[PDB]
Write a protein that binds this ligand. Sequence first.
Ligand SMILES: NS(=O)(=O)c1ccc2ccccc2c1
Ligand SMILES: NS(=O)(=O)c1ccc2ccccc2c1
Ligand SMILES: [Zn+2]
Ligand SMILES: [Zn+2]
Lengths: 251, 251
Amino acid sequence: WRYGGDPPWPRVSPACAGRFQSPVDIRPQLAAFSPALRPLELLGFQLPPLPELRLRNNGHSVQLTLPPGLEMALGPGREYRALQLHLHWGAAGRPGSEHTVEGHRFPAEIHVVHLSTAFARVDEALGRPGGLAVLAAFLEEGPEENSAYEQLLSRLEEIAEEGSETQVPGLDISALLPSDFSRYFQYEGSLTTPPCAQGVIWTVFQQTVMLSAKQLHTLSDTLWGPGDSRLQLNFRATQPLNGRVIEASFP
Amino acid sequence: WRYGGDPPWPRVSPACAGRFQSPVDIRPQLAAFSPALRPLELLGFQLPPLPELRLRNNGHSVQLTLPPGLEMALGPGREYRALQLHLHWGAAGRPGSEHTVEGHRFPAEIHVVHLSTAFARVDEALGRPGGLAVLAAFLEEGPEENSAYEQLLSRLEEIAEEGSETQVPGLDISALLPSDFSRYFQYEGSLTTPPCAQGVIWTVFQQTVMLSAKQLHTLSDTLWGPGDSRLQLNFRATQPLNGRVIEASFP
Ligand SMILES: NS(=O)(=O)c1ccc2ccccc2c1
Ligand SMILES: NS(=O)(=O)c1ccc2ccccc2c1
Ligand SMILES: [Zn+2]
Ligand SMILES: [Zn+2]
């Protein structure tokens, strides 16, 4: 499978034709304030330099495999473990976030994918209610260099080739995410690549993360994908809410 | 295990000492209004007279086995099939609801137990978040005979003995539930007997159903339980929320 070029995605996984897919356009006006949504809690995200982490150009994103030990709670009794994180971006002058706010596409987006601590494996969690949880944050142009992101961005040149990987030192994974864990959107959706299984809880931060224009250029300009093509605009088309209500942790 | 007997339920099932157990005390003024909570959808609940349904004294409750085809949705794509329903009740002038409202115990309580359509079997859903969903309604004393309940209450006579069962005509299961499907409490908890599995979504109707004094007496006074005992007071004490916020579908 590929972005903007066959095989159709439903031919690959029937679930890519589900009614309740991601990503979506968030309209803060139409979002339901629910005071039940408490601040997110992360434990174990401040990793030491060893052991090293695998960072892979899988031809559709740059993915960092996370170690055991990273615990995330959406609430009381809603407990997850982190599996991996990856990035969606655009191209020169073209934004590449997957979610949009009131139609606005941001330059890039980070996904931290988590498994419910009721399941031992992704294959058991797929399509099950709350089986997987993704933390999502927009990346926007700022005037400073983000030093958290520099640790990963400085290594992209080593994995320029499609299907290439390198080992990188552990780092504060929570420093790749906004500082505000209390203000977010939450809805139920899908994986955004085959098999596009439903039952995924998406949590989308209101606060964005700032990278420098060069950082965003390094992200969009370094990696290569299927064929002799740049790895760029690696975002799925926005999917209709189809009657789902997006909740907001804030009024 | 027995009710108000021994052993200690944590000795039978250590799961019964989990942090997120049911039932709970609902305090409506501390409930969180979430507008995302939609009206419950129940299709296929209007059963014809044939085939007949199994009604069973199991020593802990009276249990009606439900056929296939009773579909329930808590939201969009969050679907369930009804498996069975059973009751909780007190004794001569003593109430026996499981859930309580600001400390008030109601005469009796109906539980309609459903299985997520993402799971083929109950044993796969046990302990998984959203695997099971229970619809709970309070039964209160009213001036009139309830004709839906009479279909069950009039058959308790011939299953008075622990482990006896009878076949009853199909009835309209939705006629046992309250008027307004848009008005309910919701939280995540447990089975209220061993094995006390967590991940059960509890929906408690705001509105009650009314039975005659005589009907409530028939419920509390007809059935025999473990040993040469009356099957009465078959409820579990209220359990601490431990940071869980109870949600309300109405302001
Ligand atoms: N881009 S995504 O929704 O965040 C995504 C899509 C497909 C996956 C398949 C397996 C594990 C994690 C996955 C994450
Ligand atoms: N009272 S309850 O929470 O509705 C309850 C208790 C024990 C069960 C055991 C097996 C299947 C369903 C069950 C439901
Ligand atoms: Zn992604
Ligand atoms: Zn029950």
